[PDB]
Design an enzyme around this catalytic site. Sequence first.
Site: not given
Length: 164
Positions: A31, A55, A130
Site C-alpha cells: 500500500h 501487502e 509502513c
Amino acid sequence: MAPPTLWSRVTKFGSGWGFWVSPTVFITTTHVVPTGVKEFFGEPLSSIAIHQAGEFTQFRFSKKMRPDLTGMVLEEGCPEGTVCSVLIKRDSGELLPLAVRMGAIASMRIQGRLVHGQSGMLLGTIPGDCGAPYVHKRGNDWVVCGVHAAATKSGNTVVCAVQA
C-alpha cells in the site's frame, strides 16, 4: 544491536519505507508503493521484476543498486514466538527499533482483501512507518521476514506482511 549497515538498508519510499535485502532486491509494503509512475530509483519499470502478493511487494533490479550490502535471507515470515525487531525510521531521522514477539502467520483483512501476515506484540507506530522491516538473527546473520503493514487501533499490536 542492529549495526548501521543494517539500518542503512531502510529507505524512504513512497508513503512509507522499504528495505534493501541485497544489492538488487528491495522489499516494501504494497500500500505504500507509488502508483502511476514509470520508474523506481531511476530505473524504468521494464527493467525491474516486480512481485506483489498481498501487502508484500518485492522489486528485483537489473543492476546492483546497493553494492555495499551483503545479501540477506528473506524468509516467508517466521515461527510463532520469534522475537523480531522492527527497524522503524522516522522522517526526522530518529531510529525507533521495536522489539516484538510474533504470533503465527495468519490471514488478515487489510485494505479490502485477505493477506498473509503475522501479528506482533511489543515485548507506538504510525501509518508512515509502513514498509519497515521485521528482522531477527539466524546465528550471526540477520534475516528479514516481513514488512510493517498495519497496527491495531489501540496500538499494542503490529502486523507485518509476509510473502505467500
